[PDB]
């Protein structure tokens, strides 16, 4: 139903001039710079990730994001890792990256940073309380399982 | 000094990311 | 294999640190902490000098991550294209960094995708090609793996 995380998903792409500055040729391919607007990119992205993938099909998804949305495969791969494999957080990753000119977006629920991962294994109760508030217990436990 | 290829070939599959 | 020595004899001081090819989806901040390419290679030689029995693939990659800054999944695919031959491990990096390419496309012992895709050829010419590149010995060994 409702979630206060919706503010990370509902950024209006028309407010993001295209192509965004942060989108460099080491991250994206010619196809990407040929989109007409940020919204065109997002709709293609939504199409791709709403396709059907088995847990074992990271390789295909990454190939599909290269071919269809022009994201370089090594980048799509780092992203999936940041997202603990949660496909549905892909749009959020790009909207915030583009909006805030940062990569990865450092303050977004569901997007695990290097610092996030370091706090997770620090077993310093205060740092972990902050992670739980940022990502939630469900993502927290998933990430813990990500390190087993 | 060679690493058993079995242990490697599966440590690879092990480190691959799983779609949620 | 002494005719291959040239592939190992690259001077690290000719490679400015950090190399451009050395990104964040492959190396961790311990890596960029090094003061020169030579500093990194020396730690690499030291790590892999350790006594690892064929069964200790896991501890190796962990020690690699821990001591040199090489991400653990990166070590894994390398050792995999090296047919698990640890001696060729420094050769991978020196050539990767020297020619800024991951993986190095024309280096004996370093099996590329196309090399692997060529193992499935009945073309006498294709087999000959692989023998000329990696050697009879590395060829026959790569088959065994491919036949499993």
Polypeptide structure, described:
The complex is a heterotrimer, with 2 copies of chain A (148 residues) and 1 copy of chain B (20 residues). Chain A has helices spanning 6-9, 30-33, 38-49, 58-69, 73-82, 90-100, 114-120, 125-135, 137-146. By secondary structure, chain A is mainly α. The radius of gyration of chain A is 16 Å and the shape is globular. With 20 residues, chain B is mainly alpha-helical. In chain B, 55% of the residues lie in helices and 0% in strands. The longest helix of chain B is centred in the middle third of the chain and has 11 residues, at 5-15. The chains are: A mainly alpha (148), B mainly alpha (20). The A-C interface holds A 74-75, 77-78, 114 and C 23-25, 29. Chain A: Belongs to the RAP1 family. Chain A: The modification Phosphoserine is found at residue 56. Chain A: It is found in: Nucleus; Chromosome, Telomere.
Descriptive keywords:
heterotrimer; A: 148 residues; mainly alpha; Arc Repressor Mutant, subunit A; 2 domains; globular; B: mainly alpha; 1 helix; 0% strand; DNA-binding protein RAP1 (chain A); Regulatory protein SIR3 (chain B)
Short description:
The complex is a heterotrimer, with 2 copies of chain A (148 residues) and 1 copy of chain B (20 residues). Chain A has helices at residues 6-9, 30-33, 38-49, 58-69, 73-82, 90-100, 114-120, 125-135, 137-146.
């Amino acid at each position: 139903d409702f979630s206060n995380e919706d503010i990370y998903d509902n950024i209006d792409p028309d407010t993001i001039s295209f192509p965004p500055k942060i989108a460099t040729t080491d991250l994206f391919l010619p196809l990407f710079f040929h989109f007409g607007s940020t919204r065109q990119f997002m709709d293609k992205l939504h199409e791709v990730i709403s396709g059907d993938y088995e847990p074992s099909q990271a390789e295909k998804l990454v190939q599909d994001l290269c071919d269809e949305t022009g994201i370089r495969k090594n980048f799509s791969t780092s992203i999936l890792t940041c997202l603990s494999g949660d496909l549905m957080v892909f749009p959020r990753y790009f909207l915030n990256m583009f909006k805030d000119n940062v990569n990865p977006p450092p303050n977004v629920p569901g997007i695990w940073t290097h610092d996030d991962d370091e706090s997770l294994k620090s077993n310093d109760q205060e740092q972990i309380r902050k992670l739980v508030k940022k990502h939630g217990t469900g993502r927290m436990e998933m990430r813990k399982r990500f390190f087993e | 000094k060679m690493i058993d290829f079995a242990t490697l070939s599966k440590l690879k599959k092990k480190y691959q990311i799983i779609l949620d």
